[PDB]
């Protein structure tokens with residue numbers, strides 16, 4: 001795996017993602033839907049309230065901008081941290097706990113409801 | 116101004132609805148060959 | 155080969171009934187019905203058009219009554235179970251020249267002269283194709299000698315068609331003194347055939363114009379209504395307590 | 399059969415009920431029936447069939 | 450705002466327009482050349498009868 | 499303004515508004531139909547059924 | 558299907574105090590520029606295979622017909 | 628601001644120019660004449676059919692504008 | 704009763720004489736051959752396509 | 768309140784009759 005700092009294509013991809021995410025004022029982790037995985041749900045429950053509330057505020061701002069058909073002003077676009085993640089470590093810990101629980105005879109702590 | 120724009124569109128819609136309803140009912144009405152055979 | 159199989163392509167003639175506001179040339183419809191009756195009804199049939207269809211389109215009602223009274227059709231059983239023939243009325247369809255498809259094919263060398271009611275909608279590029287087919291009885295190219303019993307026609311798929319060159323100069327005498335030539339006769343008969351295939355064209359065009367205009371105005375109203383209802387949402391300022 | 403008609407009972411209905419197939423075929427071949435236009439376009443007549 | 454970019458794109462548009470006009474001129478020249486070529490060595494004459 | 503005048507006329511009770519709309523639809527449809535008919539007749543002069551020279555000479 | 562509150566403060570103006578059909582015309586050049594500069598790549602990937610295949614097909618048909626022309 | 632006024636005035640100017648043209652050269656509120664070559668309305672017809680074969684004093688009829696009209700005789 | 708279509712196509716015959724010349728070239732080749740399938744309907748189609756394209760509007764503006 | 772109610776009911780009846788005439792234009796009934 002030669003993604004970062006050694007692949008021109010990967011550098012271009014990172015540039016494009018930074019452009020788009022900062023344009024809407026989002027972060028990469030905010031793209032993780034709790035309804036999608038049910039592990040993101042547990043991670044978001046375990047995260048501190050300040051972090052979760054900031055995530056919700058950023059999501060609401062992004063949806064507002066998407067409705068209005070406009071982007072953040074250049075100032076707030078400059079003051080952006082699209083890849084200052086907050087969810088990957090907790091998500092990995094939750095996945096690891098799930099891994100051991102399934103590894104040695106355990107019921108899942110939560111399951112997706114059949115729709 | 117808003118209500119008058121809306122009113123113009125509203126009676127356009129009324130015209131459309133009357134057209135459609137009458138088209139269906141008159142289609143279910145009589146036919147030219149029958150009227151010809153009326154003698 | 156493939157070129158002759160698909161036939162020489164037909165140009166785009168400027169028909170008088172083409173355009174978002176364009177009507178049939180009704181004098182030309184009358185003239186085309188004359189030429190069809192004179193020369194084309196011997197072999198081809200319509201069988202989907204009543205005499206009453208001509209009333210108010212090309213002939214007056216008394217004229218159509220006389221024309222129908224000219225021909226005689228078989229009417230159902232009388233009080234003895236026998237069959238009889240009575241002059242045609244204003245409701246009878248156009249007469250059929252042959253008893254059935256078998257008789258038609260037998261009279262026309264195995265080839266069946268198609269029903270002409272929907273002929274311009276039953277061919278790709280209908281009206282242009284029919285006009286070109288009628289007018290383009292050309293000398294076959296070099297070294298392509300076609301068999302006896304057919305005629306060369308570049309537009310017909312395969313080049314060999316079964317009907318002979320019918321439209322000739324001076325074939326008919328028009329009522330209104332219009333000089334009868336091959337091109338004029340073709341134009342009139344194709345106008346008549348295109349009317350026969352689509353007798354509702356004028357009403358449909360009028361309805362389409364009126365309703366496209368009216369619905370465009372409705373569209374503007376809809377555009378304004380939506381913008382008005384959404385303007386309390388799109389021009390709103392929210393403070394969220396977050397920066398990055 | 400000289401006055402009333404059935405016109406809903408085919409000859410094939412009789413096999414296995416009152417007659418055998420050979421008998422029904424012979425009975426059908428007894429009578430004549432008009433048939434659709436031939437290659438010349440005329441309405442001809444042929445001996446009846448089982449159907 | 451980039452001055453060199455604006456001048457480059459202007460020169461490029463000028464050359465495109467000139468190329469279109471030159472294609473027109475070349476087609477016209479070919480038509481004239483083939484007409485006279487035939488007029489000497491072909492079926493084409495100029496007097497009607 | 500004319501908008502405020504017509505509002506004070508026919509936009510204080512919904513029944514009148516409905517009636518006004520009904521009047522508007524009928525009148526506007528008739529006006530558009532007349533205009534389109536005039537346009538059609540202007541565009542297709544000579545081609546009508548009523549003005550063909552042999553309309554009643556077959557008898 | 559619960560609703561997550563965000564603790565914002567929202568000011569909104571009534572629809573009858575705003576121009577309703579002017580935002581469509583305010584910035585046409587900027588909006589056209591944004592559309593083109595944001596979607597030229599996607600336009601190339603959409604119309605590219607189509608036009609290329611069409612040109613190839615007409616070219617090959619021309620060659621084939623001229624070759625079979627005796 | 629004023630684009631309404633400017634465009635309206637431009638269209639009005641075209642209307643006024645049309646009216647003045649119609650009165651001064653179609654009905655000639657100021658006296659004048661019209662050629663016999665344009666009012667006959669069949670002169671252009673023969674002019675075009677003559678571009679097909681233009682008469683000449685010494686020699687058979689000959690064509691004019693052979694290139695720009697693409698009209699010319701064949702093998703003979 | 705002179706045919707307007709025939710007269711018009713004769714008039715426009717010298718407009719696009721190039722397909723006609725190609726068709727004549729094939730005619731000469733086929734006359735030289737005199738033994739093959741020898742059709743070359745493609746030249747015929749090209750030439751008559753050009754003539755038909757020419758006689759498109761003039762026919763109806765000349766017709767009654 | 769009753770006068771206002773009956774006035775409103777009559778107005779709605781007039782609107783309903785106008786809608787009925789619009790849907791079914793009857794000069795045959797209008798003339799007599």
Ligand code: HEC
Pocket residue numbers: 190193194195196197198262265266267268273284287288310311315316317318320321343
């Ligand atoms: C008897 C002879 C006639 C007469 C007087 C006319 N037609 Fe034609 N026609 C006839 C036959 C036997 C056939 C079949 C040929 C075949 O399809 O192999 C046709 C065919 C047509 C067609 C169909 C062409 C096609 O489908 O590509 C048309 C459109 C047609 N005929 C028209 C037509 C018209 C308008 C006539 C009056 C001038 C006419 N035919 C006369 C036999 C005969």
